[PDB]
Amino acid sequence: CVRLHESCLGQQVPCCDPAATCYCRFFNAFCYCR
């Protein structure tokens, strides 16, 4: 799994945090669970 404050860029596991949202702020660079 991945934490909220942990990028998910091309990941293979979900976010340990269900209240998190793997979103990217920019176009294709920074992407983490917000």
Q: Which three-class secondary structure state does DSSP give residue 15?
A: strand
Q: Which residues constitute the domain of residue 13? A: 1-34
Tell me the C-alpha distance between 22 and 9, whole Å.
Answer: 9
- Kindly tell me the burial class for residue 29, based on how many C-beta atoms sit within 10 Å of its own C-beta (0-12, 13-18, 19 or more): exposed
What CATH number does the domain containing 5 carry?
Answer: 4.10.760.10
Beta-sheet pairing, 31-33 with 22-24: antiparallel
Structural domain count of the chain: 1
Contact 29, 18 (CB under 8 A): no
Tell me the C-alpha distance between 16 and 29, whole Å.
Answer: 21
Tell me the C-alpha distance between 27 and 1, whole Å.
Answer: 23
